Amino acid sequence: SHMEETRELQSLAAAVVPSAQTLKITDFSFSDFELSDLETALCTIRMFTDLNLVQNFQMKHEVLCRWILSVKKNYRKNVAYHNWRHAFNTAQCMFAALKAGKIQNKLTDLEILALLIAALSHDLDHRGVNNSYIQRSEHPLAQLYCHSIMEHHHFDQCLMILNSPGNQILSGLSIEEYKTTLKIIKQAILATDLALYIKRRGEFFELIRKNQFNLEDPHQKELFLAMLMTACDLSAITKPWPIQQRIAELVATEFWEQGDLERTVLQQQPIPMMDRNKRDELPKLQVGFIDFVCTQLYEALTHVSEDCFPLLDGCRKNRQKWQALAEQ
């Protein structure tokens, strides 16, 4: 088992590495269709790289690279999309937001750190399972928490795994930077969940629409961090149609495997989206989801965050293009 995964570790040790500037990840509508889990892990190395965090927080080298590969192997392989590739798109949106979006001139590097680590810990060791499934399939982790249990578990495994061996990038942090780190990451991973985002977002939009937002008023700023977090948690929708076909029809088939679990180990009367029958009407039910979080968040992420506009546009392009499959 592990012998093959560590053979993949030699694939890290013995394969060509295309540059991130060659691999279009700065382009928000990037083609992740051709990347392997290894290459996406390498892009994740870029995501820890350019955010000026390793210099500001003294991250260890290979401990970080194999932070990335360990989080890579830890995902259960039965899962469709909600694996390492999900973290790839999420922290793609995060890295792109904090560099291509050029927000660093605004918000502090501490916050860049919280944004990045919470972005890669938006969905650690995701089991093809959202909060509700364990809330009703009753995995022990569910009883271990209450609200946003997968994400309370993602903060739990943030503070745990980063303190766990092979992952101590927090080791170089000063106690203040470390404190702001795990705390802002706590609230943000709570907000990496789209839900507690829906909870926290209203104060943000009230503080954004009037162009009265200010970064010398730090709680509002951290709230912006959380908004970017949730903006990143669903970033897979930003991808191009030949690819997005794969991505959101794996949203289809993966919530249809999870939905098979919703109609075997759960046996609920089917809801329209995760019912397989609506293969020709699922995408509209994505839109009602997409409008519920994506566009609403990327509008504010448009009026404040700037170059991050395509992160909105790269989603909207899918709309009618999925409506086509939603139109049988």
Epitope: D260, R263, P270, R276
Partner: antibody
């Protein structure tokens, strides 16, 4: 060898419904699509309808309003409640759910008054 | 929809001869193709899946391919057991459709 199985040759009276079966074996259909089909002799195995892991029945219009499927995934079974062409060999198969391979003998129904 | 017509039915060819069980999709199906070993009054077996990949337990002497539209189950090293029905199927698209069947015959 992995195999589906069904009732053998039967001679029902005209106007009398005949309760067909499709007992899959050698694999759980608990994760699989199941597809009923008809064979009027030496012709295309004309389609009847199908059922998914969702457990909801589905029919061809030819058998919709006529045929009455009752199927279950954990039981790996698909019943099919039901002319000289209907006097036929009814087959049924399967498919992986992630996918977009085994058969019963084909129930030889014979309808005549 | 996509009918799986088979012009092949009752060819009379000698044992060990190569033979082709033609079939034809009316529309594109991709590589998602499934050949089958039918018998009257008795259980059919799978022959081929994914255009090329073969059924578990059927002999490899058979060949079975074709894709998109044109299809052909070219039985090779044909035997008397091979002289039974065969039908093409798409698992590619709903409703699934099926071959006319083809009861191969030994030549004499």
């Amino acid at each position: 060898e992995v195999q589906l199985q069904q009732s053998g040759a039967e001679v029902v009276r005209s106007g009398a419904s005949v309760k067909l079966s499709c007992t899959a074996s050698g694999f759980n259909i608990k994760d699989y699509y199941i597809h009923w089909v008809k064979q009027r002799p030496e012709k295309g195995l004309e389609w009847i309808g199908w059922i998914d892991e969702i457990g909801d029945t589905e029919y061809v219009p030819k058998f919709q309003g006529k045929a009455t499927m009752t199927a279950d995934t954990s039981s790996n079974t698909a019943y099919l409640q039901l002319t000289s062409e209907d006097t036929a060999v009814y087959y049924c198969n399967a498919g992986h759910d992630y996918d977009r391979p085994y058969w019963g003998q084909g129930t030889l129904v014979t309808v005549s008054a | 929809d996509i009918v799986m017509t088979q012009s092949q039915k009752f060819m009379s060819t000698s044992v060990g001869d190569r033979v082709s069980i033609t079939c034809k999709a009316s529309q594109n199906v991709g590589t998602a193709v499934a050949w089958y070993q039918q018998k009257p009054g008795q259980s059919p077996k799978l022959m081929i899946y994914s255009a090329s990949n073969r059924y578990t337990g059927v002999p490899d002497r058979f060949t079975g391919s074709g894709s998109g539209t044109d299809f052909t189950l070219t039985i090779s090293n044909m035997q008397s057991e091979d002289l039974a029905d065969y039908f093409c199927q798409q698992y590619s698209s709903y409703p699934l459709t099926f071959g006319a069947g083809t009861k191969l015959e030994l030549k004499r």
